[PDB]
Ligand binder design. Sequence first.
Ligand SMILES: CO[C@@H]1O[C@H](CS[C@]2(C(=O)O)C[C@H](O)[C@@H](NC(C)=O)[C@H]([C@H](O)[C@H](O)CO)O2)[C@H](O)[C@H](O)[C@H]1O
Ligand SMILES: CO[C@@H]1O[C@H](CS[C@]2(C(=O)O)C[C@H](O)[C@@H](NC(C)=O)[C@H]([C@H](O)[C@H](O)CO)O2)[C@H](O)[C@H](O)[C@H]1O
Ligand SMILES: CC(=O)N[C@H]1[C@H]([C@H](O)[C@H](O)CO)OC(C(=O)O)=C[C@@H]1O
Ligand SMILES: CC(=O)N[C@H]1[C@H]([C@H](O)[C@H](O)CO)OC(C(=O)O)=C[C@@H]1O
Lengths: 446, 446
Amino acid sequence: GAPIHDPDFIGGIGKELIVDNASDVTSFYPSAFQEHLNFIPAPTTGSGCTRIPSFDMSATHYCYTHNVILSGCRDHSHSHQYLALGVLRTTATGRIFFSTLRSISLDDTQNRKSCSVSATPLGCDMLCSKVTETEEEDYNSAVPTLMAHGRLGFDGQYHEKDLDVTTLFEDWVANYPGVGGGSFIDGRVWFSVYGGLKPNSPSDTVQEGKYVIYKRYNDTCPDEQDYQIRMAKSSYKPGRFGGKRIQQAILSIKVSTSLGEDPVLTVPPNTVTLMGAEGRILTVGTSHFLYQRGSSYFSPALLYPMTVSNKTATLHSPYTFNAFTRPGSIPCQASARCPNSCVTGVYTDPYPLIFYRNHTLRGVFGTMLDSEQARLNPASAVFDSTSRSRITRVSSSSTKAAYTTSTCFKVVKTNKTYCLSIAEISNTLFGEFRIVPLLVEILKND
Amino acid sequence: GAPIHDPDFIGGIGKELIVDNASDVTSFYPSAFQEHLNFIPAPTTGSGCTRIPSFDMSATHYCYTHNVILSGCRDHSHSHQYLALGVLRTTATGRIFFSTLRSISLDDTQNRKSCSVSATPLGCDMLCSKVTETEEEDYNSAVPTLMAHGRLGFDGQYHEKDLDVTTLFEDWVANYPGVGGGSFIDGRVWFSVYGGLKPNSPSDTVQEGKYVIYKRYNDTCPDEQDYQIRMAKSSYKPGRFGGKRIQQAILSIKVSTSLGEDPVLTVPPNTVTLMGAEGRILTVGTSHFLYQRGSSYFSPALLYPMTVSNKTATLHSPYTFNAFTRPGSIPCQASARCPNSCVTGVYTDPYPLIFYRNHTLRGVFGTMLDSEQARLNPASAVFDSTSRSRITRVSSSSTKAAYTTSTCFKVVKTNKTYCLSIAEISNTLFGEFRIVPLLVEILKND
Ligand SMILES: CO[C@@H]1O[C@H](CS[C@]2(C(=O)O)C[C@H](O)[C@@H](NC(C)=O)[C@H]([C@H](O)[C@H](O)CO)O2)[C@H](O)[C@H](O)[C@H]1O
Ligand SMILES: CO[C@@H]1O[C@H](CS[C@]2(C(=O)O)C[C@H](O)[C@@H](NC(C)=O)[C@H]([C@H](O)[C@H](O)CO)O2)[C@H](O)[C@H](O)[C@H]1O
Ligand SMILES: CC(=O)N[C@H]1[C@H]([C@H](O)[C@H](O)CO)OC(C(=O)O)=C[C@@H]1O
Ligand SMILES: CC(=O)N[C@H]1[C@H]([C@H](O)[C@H](O)CO)OC(C(=O)O)=C[C@@H]1O
């Protein structure tokens, strides 16, 4: 009898929440922040660093995890992980609360990093990278980044198995997990991923030449056409890692009593994907979406529809929201409209919230950071391809923030739609960051 | 099969930690705060108020609870309690983390306040006072404060039974749990409760003329022996609650599947006890103590030796740790030495740490608010009968704070002793307070 959310939630997890062909996506907006049970551990010392939140939830249980670095967020020697496996429940007065059932600190010699979780029928699958050298150091590591598929079962026990990267990520130099969540689809769990591709490798050659240029809604990038093409053509090998091709990619693994069984990579064509970066594998109802961080020139939040057959996947022309920009360094700030070759941004995923009877997406929820270049002013709101709804603010004052990963669901019992935005926040006295789960109820005008 | 601490801990919970005869109690001291699994939920909204912690850990599991008011700590409207049942575990590296197994939000049609939890073999026993009026108002409500004995079972479910206060606390006008953890002894759960006595009632006339005068160690009170007796006599009828007799008591309930089964109140004779205040029932080894907050004139930490005979217990002359003082308010400041009438102070307890082979208590661990009147600057450390050891600070700046309670334990394996100190700390952005569980390893100078 494995852990399941309370009955008030059954049928309201990971499904298409608001199907309204009439009303305007934006008429829907986030209410003020709600007080729920804060299930994400805060730093217990003045220097402790807790970052990189990853979270997924299936119709039965939810998974969560983050990074813990004793000395400070800058130290990159060792560090452990925190994992949680729980279920949603309600109080007599119908308040909701994330009730973790298994809370453990996974800490041993091995230094995992940038890990992603996903709710599977066995427990909480986690995809990790185990590093020695720094990111910069590893991208030069001719040999591909070491990876391991782990899992925290309903029994509180943890087990993992390193994946044979010398083959799996053969044509790579660096290869880390998208940090965003993974999703379970057809007995398989699909994680996002990116990293470096060994130049001139079989893999590097098919992408060689392939580019793609997504544009802003109302801003037509001036710079001549020949200029834009060439720029994009190179936006896949930024100077940050010495021209190395940072390619997107999606890994799948068979979900069974054997961790890391039947892995399979799927390297989409840059003719459709953009510069590789952190991403999340979403699943709402019957649709699937690959979220990709805006680490390149494109600023608007993206969403590449995903389809699966066999053990591989297929991306498609991305859904986009212009109001959903992210802070980033010039020439790739929040308003950037021209293809360039940078590498910045921050993880801030959009959650599919409103569809059409024809099951096409329309509205999304998530937490952006209003600010051209710096990582400031968290902001929660509903977004359509163009505009933004009334917003709710973490703070009406300038505020330091980081990764924000959202997720919505409904309490059928109290017919209400809630959204969970796990946001990295600045913190005093106890470390650099506090990973707090903001909770909002989706309300609509009249 | 019930939950239980990893074997590395078995034998190191609720026992005498240090048995020394010559070593100076103060030669031991707290390590720098450690980085462990923050198991205490933090606010999630800008106004959420989380206060009044309560902790108790038996040889098998640990219980924890705190209160939560939505609109800010001053609002008296409604409120709900957060609960957690868990056990201690270790990582591959041998680090420790409090792994909670049952995490819930108790919120309903009732308002529970000033609750105290205790680890019973049936789960996590809780005692709360259900309020429908403010404290001042209830201290004038001829009738007794309604209460209930509840319990979060190992299965996750919570159950409670209202007590027949009109008979049980028949001689009281108000009565609440000491907020400080209770203890399980001889098949009954024991809680420290306090409140106001119904003037002229049997329970009240017997404490007539009874008092005690606790003096500081070095200092000496000038005042006449006459002026002293009176002051001490009237310290039990302070002016904050209309001269009512603020009384101290201990409630025992039988631990069984029937909640509230055969409870029994014990009202110690004021020839030994000071004015009624928040308390706690500690059990270290074969020794039972009673901690009494210093809401009256006596500044030093108090630990009343508690012996038990069936359903009733007896108290003895306290152990005073004259260095372990609390912030008061003139004339009852941290330095106070003469008997007076006041209802101030704060909750900051001392856990029985160091013992004589003859079981006599020699030293204690705790965290005091190192100030004279205001509630500022936390500070952890070992305390003997007269002085404080080296100190570990939350911060070296002026830091606002409040309640703090501590429990220590030994990791039999590496034979290392640790003290967990839960303290309400000042917080920013998210609520007026953040309850952070502090962790420290007790060290010996050389
Ligand atoms: C000067 O007017 C202020 O208007 C504020 C609007 S509502 C809200 C917001 O910005 O969304 C609701 C948020 O949940 C709240 N933040 C948190 C963390 O709970 C936010 C803060 O209160 C705001 O940032 C104030 O600093 O407010 C709100 O009514 C303020 O109280 C008004 O003073
Ligand atoms: C203020 O100068 C530094 O003091 C440090 C003392 S140790 C310690 C303390 O106050 O005991 C250890 C505490 O765990 C730590 N606080 C937290 C929350 O982790 C505290 C603060 O880090 C310090 O106080 C800063 O405010 O420090 C130590 O000697 C340092 O080397 C000094 O530079
Ligand atoms: C593997 C790794 O180092 N991840 C880091 C990531 C990375 O630098 C970026 O995705 C460029 O690849 O960025 C950041 C960051 O706060 O922005 C934090 C992550 O820890
Ligand atoms: C029942 C109740 O109200 N308890 C309160 C307690 C009480 O007032 C004291 O024991 C006598 O004054 O004080 C405080 C406080 O920070 O001091 C908080 C508690 O909420």
